[PDB]
């Protein structure tokens, strides 16, 4: 019954899910973490399993 | 000296707590990453705060 979420027109404070909300397991497929700051998404999609 | 969700940040290339805070393995890392238990010897009934 997942959700599939639409972001847009807003940026990729993606920080705080490291810590603010400190979820153990991050393994980032396809664009490795860190560099998500710049050229990063343009039809983001979140999926809630 | 780690818990027990630990082990996995240990290897080249990877990222976490231990990779950004507390120790970052070389991505060109020639070596053996070996671990045991130590619940008989780095524990404390009320917790090894140490």
Same mark, same amino acid.
């Given at each position: /019954? ?6 847009? *027109?807003?940026?990729?404070? !993606?920080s &705080?899910? !490291?810590?603010? /909300?400190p979820?153990?397991a991050?393994?980032? !497929?396809? &664009? ?10 343009? *039809?983001? !999609?979140?999926?809630?399993? | ?8 940040? %240990?290897?080249?290339?990877? @990222?976490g707590? %231990?990779?950004? $805070?507390? $120790?970052?393995?070389?991505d060109?890392f @020639?070596?053996?990453? %070996? ?16």
């Amino acid at each position: /019954a997942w959700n599939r979420t639409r972001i847009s *027109n807003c940026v990729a404070d !993606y920080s &705080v899910l !490291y810590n603010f /909300a400190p979820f153990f397991a991050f393994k980032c !497929y396809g &664009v490795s973490p860190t560099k998500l700051n710049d050229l990063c998404f343009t *039809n983001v !999609y979140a999926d809630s399993f | 000296v780690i818990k027990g969700n630990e082990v996995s940040q %240990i290897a080249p290339g990877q @990222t976490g707590n %231990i990779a950004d $805070y507390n $120790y970052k393995l070389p991505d060109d890392f @020639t070596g053996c990453v %070996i671990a045991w238990n130590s619940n008989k010897l780095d524990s404390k009934h009320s917790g090894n705060y140490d």
